[PDB]
Amino acid sequence: STGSATTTPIDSLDDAYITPVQIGTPAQTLNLDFDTGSSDLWVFSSETTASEVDGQTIYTPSKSTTAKLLSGATWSISYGDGSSSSGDVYTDTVSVGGLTVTGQAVESAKKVSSSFTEDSTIDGLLGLAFSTLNTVSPTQQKTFFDNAKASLDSPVFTADLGYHAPGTYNFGFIDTTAYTGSITYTAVSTKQGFWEWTSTGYAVGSGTFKSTSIDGIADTGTTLLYLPATVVSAYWAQVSGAKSSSSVGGYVFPCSATLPSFTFGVGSARIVIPGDYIDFGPISTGSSSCFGGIQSSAGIGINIFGDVALKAAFVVFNGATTPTLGFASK
Question: For labelling alongside 271, which of 110, 141, 152, 306 has CA 20 to 30 A away?
Fold first, then answer.
């Protein structure tokens, strides 16, 4: 089997992407944030504290003939941005782009933090990291991809995020029309539960390529590109007037600037992030100070190849017995 779903930016900055997901019988369609940096599929629901719901579409398990309470199971998760959610668990039928999993753990939110409430466009998350990170207790649950794997034509899913435009998540096949040149595959460590890999270096604009190992995670659920302070400093030094602002919480730059591209290495191959991808616009409405799309990972504890980087590539998440990551230009 295979699945194919369109994923759509939630706003004009590509702050995140939502993908429609069918849950239950009859189908309840929720727009979820596919997150290769976490491993919980959780949804706004009929159980969510009413004051914490503001415009989201909710899952109502009592209206699904295939929903079953997973007795005794609870979940609770905290994300790198400080947001969080928690609740209990149902199993139900979940379909993504024509691909159906029965008995999928659907984590029903009783509580969500303000960040989720305030984002009316995201109805929940669908985690696509390794199931070892799943927070369901006392019986850890599998991700949608894990449950689907054996049924898939090939044990892979691909992320093809658009710049200011829709893209595609495919399950079970590689669309060879969706990228240019070849896919370069690179090793993955699952030790931390992430799609963790090592970039072979970077360049800034038309600058020479610096060969250097950068360990990081391919994370569709993170907006920006978080890299070592040395790298990030080298990038913003090429932007007149750019500076790190503690009060804003990262690198800002004059909105009148033309940003240089950023290249990252995948083995001997190179992915080029156009400068425009690195512009996240005024820090506040009307400001002439713009927020940078490349930020320091110092104090995160991990480098993150988030959407800024991933949207410049066609990315293969290869879930074979020995997982790997593939990158192609597009």
Answer: 152
